[PDB]
Amino acid sequence: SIVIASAARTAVGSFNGAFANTPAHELGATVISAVLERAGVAAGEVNEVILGQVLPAGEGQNPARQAAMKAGVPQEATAWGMNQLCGSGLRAVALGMQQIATGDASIIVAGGMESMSMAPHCAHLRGGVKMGDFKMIDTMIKDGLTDAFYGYHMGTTAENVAKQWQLSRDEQDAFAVASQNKAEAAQKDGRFKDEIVPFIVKGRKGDITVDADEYIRHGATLDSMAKLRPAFDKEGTVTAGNASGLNDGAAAALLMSEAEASRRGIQPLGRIVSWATVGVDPKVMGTGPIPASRKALERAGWKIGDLDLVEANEAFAAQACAVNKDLGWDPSIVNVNGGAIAIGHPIGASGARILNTLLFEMKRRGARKGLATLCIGGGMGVAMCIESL
Amino acid sequence: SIVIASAARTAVGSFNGAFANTPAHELGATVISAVLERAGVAAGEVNEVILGQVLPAGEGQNPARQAAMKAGVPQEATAWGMNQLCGSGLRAVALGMQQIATGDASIIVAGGMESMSMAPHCAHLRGGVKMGDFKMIDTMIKDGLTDAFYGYHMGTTAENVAKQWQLSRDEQDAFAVASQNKAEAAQKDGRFKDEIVPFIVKGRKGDITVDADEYIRHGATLDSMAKLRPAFDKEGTVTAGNASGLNDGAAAALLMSEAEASRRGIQPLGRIVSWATVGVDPKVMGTGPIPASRKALERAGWKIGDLDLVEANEAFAAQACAVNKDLGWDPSIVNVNGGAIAIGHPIGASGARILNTLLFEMKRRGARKGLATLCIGGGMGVAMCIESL
Amino acid sequence: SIVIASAARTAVGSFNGAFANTPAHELGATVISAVLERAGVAAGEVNEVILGQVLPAGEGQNPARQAAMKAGVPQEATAWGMNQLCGSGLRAVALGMQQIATGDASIIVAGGMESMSMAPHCAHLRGGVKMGDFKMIDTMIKDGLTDAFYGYHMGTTAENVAKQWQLSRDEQDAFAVASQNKAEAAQKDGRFKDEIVPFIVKGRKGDITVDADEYIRHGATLDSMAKLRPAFDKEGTVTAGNASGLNDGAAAALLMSEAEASRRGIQPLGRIVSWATVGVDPKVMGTGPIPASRKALERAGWKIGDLDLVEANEAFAAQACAVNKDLGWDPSIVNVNGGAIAIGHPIGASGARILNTLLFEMKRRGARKGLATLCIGGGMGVAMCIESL
Amino acid sequence: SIVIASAARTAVGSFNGAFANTPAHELGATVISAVLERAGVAAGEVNEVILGQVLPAGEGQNPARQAAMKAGVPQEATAWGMNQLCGSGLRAVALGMQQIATGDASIIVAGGMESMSMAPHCAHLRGGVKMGDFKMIDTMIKDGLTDAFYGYHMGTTAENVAKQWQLSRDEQDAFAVASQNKAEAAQKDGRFKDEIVPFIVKGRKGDITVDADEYIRHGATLDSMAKLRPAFDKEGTVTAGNASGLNDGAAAALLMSEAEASRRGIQPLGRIVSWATVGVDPKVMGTGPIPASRKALERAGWKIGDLDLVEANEAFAAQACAVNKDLGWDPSIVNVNGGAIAIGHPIGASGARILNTLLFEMKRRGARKGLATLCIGGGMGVAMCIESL
């Protein structure tokens, strides 16, 4: 029924680092044309582009449409952006899967992009401020990392899960280190090369080709991890080291019917066998993946034990351990090449980033069933089940 | 298979007018509850809330989820915002229909919301400005009304359509006045009452209930219309008078399978027979509805001649006329109670707004087949065909 | 030896009132032209322009020079601004007196001007704000009204004078209401028209002539004052009622040696016989007038009791009562036409504003000896003794 | 009559360099304390503090008073800031002299301070921006360096002087490199150590003592000056290399009557024999020094040829050479240790800085008469004559 013919992602950049002044639709563009090249499909055959992106303030009208056009997709196809926070990138793949399934389209490019670096500061000033000081709001924090019901940062929701699941600092720190060592190990062996599509940072006094995840840290020590101070709760347990970071990146999938891919001689990275999205208490949003995953599994007709590979977004060490602890899947098959803590977390692009990794790892190790899942701010989870062919 | 059980929209506010300090999700909340009460469905039965929103900068995390919770949809439900600019409000409805059609959901609330008044000013200031002025960009103008590829305002795209279709000032002015006249007659006759859910503007020095579209002008003259100066092209033909405005509002639909409405005793407002979306040149984006309306009819198996009622959004007189002229539908069944030039145009909500108008007008006149269509910035169009039950 | 040959002030404007968008330099130009006109002195005879001004942020390079150039003063002449906060407007006259006393100038235009309304909001952003919110500071609050040592507003130094001299709510309100009622009467009888020169506020849709003190309240009641809440100390005694306001005006005086006025045949408004400036504790800055008036009087060889009229600025009912209480001059010769609670307080202009009032009333009633004194933020005073010729 | 008993200055710092985050008043407090100390004068004997300062926006209420207080000046003394742009620091000394000359004070601390690195960005936002981007203005550029009559930078006034006097790139560049090599030589022989009082930059992770001018360039080459492009006129002649820079510093002088020095046993740095300030056309404001110097010499009874040492500020090479050309003084007695091109240009501090410089070279080489002079944007100049005792 609906398969992913090809996929591609840029390397994930560090906050104000390599993509510092690069607008998300520029990276978007690169990824959309990679997926077409990669499958052998022409720009002109795309019906629509669906990109999740949570922080587009100042980027101009519909940046999804700017990405498509810049990548060569003609003015005839359509494009749209969408937000389900951290779930946006994965969610977008299921929404183009739906576009094909209802017969509204034949070929979609779907995924997500995000420039946390380029997120602006803002103020509402139409009414004027007659007397007194006013705040200039960091939009990446307000619109992307602050709970809207309790007023605190995602990090505190992580702390709520820590306390609730009784996850000690040492246990989260342990998890962190592992994801770094695993991310580092996979980068060193070229495991991220199929998925990555080098992005050219158009310079003035030099153009730079970025093709490596710059946020992974080499030789991460437990000692360094245990000396960091808690970032959200002054006497807390979550720190910079065991939480994901602020990052830039884009990632996408090229979707079509199974039969179309076959008419084209394409060898798909997998078949979308199910997806699901479920809400949870916004206070412990990190638990998102538990209910979404299981639903996903139930709609596919699979048992947790059937899964050969799993990508469960590393928002915070606290929430990842809780996810794994509750679902019980075998830890060795989850985030095999590392996670967000090491790799980075470009909010709107993250769900399609983890899809890429899942998809290129399933191919390279011959796994047949996989699942990607993320926790979403505001209390939500998104999960998708993929089967190789 | 999928029907519109109920529907509701707030009145449309004037810019920096009645909803001048109201956050879009507030407007949204009210409409999610309204569609819920109107159909006798309880919030706890809502699976997901889908809202189109184009300018949510500063409103914090995913305003769609903040509107769903404010309305009382439990935290176990899901919510997301999407953006296909002007067609967002109608595309949400389509996207929500798909959720039920693929069996991912049973009940969906969908439409759009917008607070153009509350759109902030912004600046990318992470680097630091070492010397010189810097701009504070109005996100309303940059993210909602400025072509991203040509750098000019929608008004200019209108002008291109004017010139191209050879639509003179008087013909554009004539259209506008007719729109005001029809919207004003509709207003006095109580034609807007069913669709409108009164919104309470929570005050300090008193509460204010708004239940009337405040941008419609009473007794609009042709003389006043002909004295205005061109707004975009210094020696052009589009004016403030023959273009839509900048406004705030929200509007939605409670969607469910026809079998489900029937198990509940609900008398739906319509059956979704088909929807379509197509791209066109961004420079003449106002031509968008032509291809998209025709696609939709084709998918529905209908002839233009089969339509009993049409709502084709009035971004600008020149594009409205070109659309009508090209499609050839009978002017007398298009925007029977007036259009966006008089009612206003709250960007993300405008398609759900027009869907409400269409749906309450088909029920009161007993029309059987209707279409809603809108042009989209960046060069796109969206249309949806509805059949009464 | 140095006389004030002529003087003029604009009407004082309400905060964001008549002069809401008129830069201070436009108002001092009209006052420069009026002093010249009023003493039969041409602009090519001016040696230098000295204008007190506390909040010139954003107006451009040296607004004293922009006033002088606008009034037609030759480019050969010089001009500078100075700032001793609320004593600025009077100090200036004292400083222009000094340039002729030491032989460096013959003819000076001295005084002050201020647009509190045009004061901007600001932030030091050269270093860059990595992330988080940051304050946009009101410069009129920060730079003109807050004590730099103690961190609280001028209104709390008022509270400190009230406690310390034990001034009740009631005594302060009566002082307040007597200030509005004497100023309304003087306005209604015409006593402000000789000192005010009309200001033209360049319109687009109309030029407006402003020749009346708009902050003065007509029919001010004891009751409405008595109902006010304390503004600075949630449970104090200074309110908006008994404190001066935030305002806009300019005011000046034209000086020359007495020998030079006799050579041109001008009948001067008075002789500067002495001035004095003295510090006090910043915490009771309201007391400034006491030692500064004392010292002026001793330098003039006069007894408090030799004075015939006195203008003692009303920063706050509390400090005005304290000052009158200690000096012990006959209250019936103080502010006979009302003071700053009713007229307003445009900070850098105020001392020239009250000098004007002093001068014109000395002339109309034939007073021979006068004194003008203000309290200054940061803990200081300035006083000036004037005798008629 | 009035002498300079002692003087002192901080090292001048580079834009966003050593004093990047130090408010102006801190640097003035250290110089107020160093002139007290250098003359055996205690702070309690200080009657008034006079500081030139052009850009104090956001520092709070009257920084002159905040530096005085920080230096321990009693709260019984007074303090005020003034603004005659570039001539501020030296005009202050002249007005402090006047204070003693007319017997209103016996002891004054006078000079300037300026923190161009701490100058903020601002915007007048009281009336609000209904729609449309607005500028955040750099207060250093607008209030400091932009001519208010013509709208262009000081650099362009420099261009007008170069064209008018026909100074070539080459002669300007040679001027610049001789300024850099004279200051460097001066710095290395310890000629700046008597005048400089060390400033402690209070750190967190350590305190740094600054006692060296850091803008001086070591081994500045002609070739590096000749390859620069013109900064203000895309095809002009003024560059960053031949203009002064953006800088931070403070500088002052302690003043008293000659008779009082003599009763204290002080050996003063010189006697102020006269000053003058004269206006010129704003467009060629760099020529300010010509008439102001001629007037001051006239007032002293001195011929150009009687001077033994001159400091003539180096705003720009072009205006410096024009001034030297016109005046005709021997170039070897001008800026003998370098000028502002090398040392920097902290606006309000500059004239006190170059005075410092004059005074310590006149004592070290035993020069009897000197003059200090600066060009002032808006079209002005100040000059001051000094003789040794």
PDB file of C-alpha atoms in Angstrom, chain C residues 35-130:
ATOM      1  CA  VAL C  35      12.828  85.429  22.903  1.00  0.00           C
ATOM      2  CA  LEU C  36      14.525  87.211  20.062  1.00  0.00           C
ATOM      3  CA  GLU C  37      11.257  88.646  18.760  1.00  0.00           C
ATOM      4  CA  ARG C  38      10.296  89.708  22.201  1.00  0.00           C
ATOM      5  CA  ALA C  39      13.469  91.669  22.925  1.00  0.00           C
ATOM      6  CA  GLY C  40      14.013  93.246  19.297  1.00  0.00           C
ATOM      7  CA  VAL C  41      17.164  91.082  18.966  1.00  0.00           C
ATOM      8  CA  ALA C  42      17.921  89.381  15.738  1.00  0.00           C
ATOM      9  CA  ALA C  43      19.055  85.746  15.337  1.00  0.00           C
ATOM     10  CA  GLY C  44      22.485  86.913  13.781  1.00  0.00           C
ATOM     11  CA  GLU C  45      23.341  88.522  17.118  1.00  0.00           C
ATOM     12  CA  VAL C  46      23.191  85.264  19.130  1.00  0.00           C
ATOM     13  CA  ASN C  47      26.616  84.023  20.394  1.00  0.00           C
ATOM     14  CA  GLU C  48      25.423  80.782  21.953  1.00  0.00           C
ATOM     15  CA  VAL C  49      22.459  78.623  22.785  1.00  0.00           C
ATOM     16  CA  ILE C  50      22.428  76.620  26.104  1.00  0.00           C
ATOM     17  CA  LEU C  51      19.579  74.143  26.596  1.00  0.00           C
ATOM     18  CA  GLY C  52      19.058  71.832  29.577  1.00  0.00           C
ATOM     19  CA  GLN C  53      17.605  68.535  28.383  1.00  0.00           C
ATOM     20  CA  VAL C  54      17.607  65.254  30.290  1.00  0.00           C
ATOM     21  CA  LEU C  55      16.265  62.816  27.647  1.00  0.00           C
ATOM     22  CA  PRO C  56      17.628  63.425  24.132  1.00  0.00           C
ATOM     23  CA  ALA C  57      18.104  59.758  23.264  1.00  0.00           C
ATOM     24  CA  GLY C  58      17.310  59.212  19.595  1.00  0.00           C
ATOM     25  CA  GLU C  59      16.822  62.852  18.598  1.00  0.00           C
ATOM     26  CA  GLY C  60      20.251  63.001  16.901  1.00  0.00           C
ATOM     27  CA  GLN C  61      23.388  64.930  17.410  1.00  0.00           C
ATOM     28  CA  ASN C  62      23.184  67.801  19.971  1.00  0.00           C
ATOM     29  CA  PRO C  63      19.449  68.918  19.873  1.00  0.00           C
ATOM     30  CA  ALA C  64      20.537  72.325  21.347  1.00  0.00           C
ATOM     31  CA  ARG C  65      22.276  72.885  18.064  1.00  0.00           C
ATOM     32  CA  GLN C  66      19.292  71.590  16.038  1.00  0.00           C
ATOM     33  CA  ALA C  67      17.006  74.094  17.928  1.00  0.00           C
ATOM     34  CA  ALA C  68      19.382  76.968  17.256  1.00  0.00           C
ATOM     35  CA  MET C  69      19.833  76.176  13.562  1.00  0.00           C
ATOM     36  CA  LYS C  70      16.054  75.813  13.185  1.00  0.00           C
ATOM     37  CA  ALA C  71      15.491  79.229  14.747  1.00  0.00           C
ATOM     38  CA  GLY C  72      17.903  80.758  12.243  1.00  0.00           C
ATOM     39  CA  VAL C  73      20.853  81.357  14.750  1.00  0.00           C
ATOM     40  CA  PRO C  74      23.982  81.645  12.384  1.00  0.00           C
ATOM     41  CA  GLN C  75      26.214  78.654  11.916  1.00  0.00           C
ATOM     42  CA  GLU C  76      28.948  80.899  13.410  1.00  0.00           C
ATOM     43  CA  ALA C  77      27.262  80.689  16.872  1.00  0.00           C
ATOM     44  CA  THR C  78      27.515  77.688  19.187  1.00  0.00           C
ATOM     45  CA  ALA C  79      25.125  75.551  21.215  1.00  0.00           C
ATOM     46  CA  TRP C  80      25.246  72.760  23.836  1.00  0.00           C
ATOM     47  CA  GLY C  81      22.906  70.786  26.089  1.00  0.00           C
ATOM     48  CA  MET C  82      23.471  70.114  29.764  1.00  0.00           C
ATOM     49  CA  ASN C  83      21.906  68.040  32.435  1.00  0.00           C
ATOM     50  CA  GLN C  84      21.474  68.569  36.159  1.00  0.00           C
ATOM     51  CA  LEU C  85      18.088  66.693  35.838  1.00  0.00           C
ATOM     52  CA  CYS C  86      15.102  68.874  37.059  1.00  0.00           C
ATOM     53  CA  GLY C  87      17.368  71.879  37.839  1.00  0.00           C
ATOM     54  CA  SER C  88      18.659  71.841  34.240  1.00  0.00           C
ATOM     55  CA  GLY C  89      16.325  74.573  32.749  1.00  0.00           C
ATOM     56  CA  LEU C  90      17.317  77.045  35.601  1.00  0.00           C
ATOM     57  CA  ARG C  91      21.071  76.083  35.806  1.00  0.00           C
ATOM     58  CA  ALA C  92      21.265  76.794  32.213  1.00  0.00           C
ATOM     59  CA  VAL C  93      20.221  80.479  32.730  1.00  0.00           C
ATOM     60  CA  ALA C  94      22.862  80.592  35.498  1.00  0.00           C
ATOM     61  CA  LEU C  95      25.447  79.152  33.081  1.00  0.00           C
ATOM     62  CA  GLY C  96      24.522  81.539  30.192  1.00  0.00           C
ATOM     63  CA  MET C  97      24.890  84.360  32.847  1.00  0.00           C
ATOM     64  CA  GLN C  98      28.416  83.145  33.524  1.00  0.00           C
ATOM     65  CA  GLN C  99      29.488  83.283  29.858  1.00  0.00           C
ATOM     66  CA  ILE C 100      28.731  87.093  29.765  1.00  0.00           C
ATOM     67  CA  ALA C 101      30.109  87.681  33.298  1.00  0.00           C
ATOM     68  CA  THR C 102      33.521  86.278  32.260  1.00  0.00           C
ATOM     69  CA  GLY C 103      33.559  88.212  28.941  1.00  0.00           C
ATOM     70  CA  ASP C 104      33.253  85.191  26.605  1.00  0.00           C
ATOM     71  CA  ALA C 105      29.803  85.969  25.165  1.00  0.00           C
ATOM     72  CA  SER C 106      27.563  89.083  24.798  1.00  0.00           C
ATOM     73  CA  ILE C 107      24.148  87.593  24.020  1.00  0.00           C
ATOM     74  CA  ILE C 108      22.965  84.133  25.188  1.00  0.00           C
ATOM     75  CA  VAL C 109      19.720  82.247  24.698  1.00  0.00           C
ATOM     76  CA  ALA C 110      19.496  79.943  27.744  1.00  0.00           C
ATOM     77  CA  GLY C 111      16.774  77.666  29.073  1.00  0.00           C
ATOM     78  CA  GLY C 112      15.556  74.126  28.621  1.00  0.00           C
ATOM     79  CA  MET C 113      13.389  71.797  26.674  1.00  0.00           C
ATOM     80  CA  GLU C 114      12.076  68.265  26.969  1.00  0.00           C
ATOM     81  CA  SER C 115       9.854  65.742  25.162  1.00  0.00           C
ATOM     82  CA  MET C 116       9.146  63.031  27.777  1.00  0.00           C
ATOM     83  CA  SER C 117       6.628  61.707  25.287  1.00  0.00           C
ATOM     84  CA  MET C 118       9.346  61.095  22.606  1.00  0.00           C
ATOM     85  CA  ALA C 119      11.703  59.346  24.952  1.00  0.00           C
ATOM     86  CA  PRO C 120      12.465  55.912  23.565  1.00  0.00           C
ATOM     87  CA  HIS C 121      12.848  52.365  24.861  1.00  0.00           C
ATOM     88  CA  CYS C 122      16.337  50.834  24.712  1.00  0.00           C
ATOM     89  CA  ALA C 123      18.624  47.864  25.232  1.00  0.00           C
ATOM     90  CA  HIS C 124      22.402  47.313  25.076  1.00  0.00           C
ATOM     91  CA  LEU C 125      22.617  44.607  22.398  1.00  0.00           C
ATOM     92  CA  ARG C 126      26.118  44.995  20.959  1.00  0.00           C
ATOM     93  CA  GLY C 127      27.328  41.983  22.906  1.00  0.00           C
ATOM     94  CA  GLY C 128      24.388  39.794  21.699  1.00  0.00           C
ATOM     95  CA  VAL C 129      21.816  38.074  23.931  1.00  0.00           C
ATOM     96  CA  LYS C 130      22.562  34.377  23.534  1.00  0.00           C
TER      97      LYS C 130
END
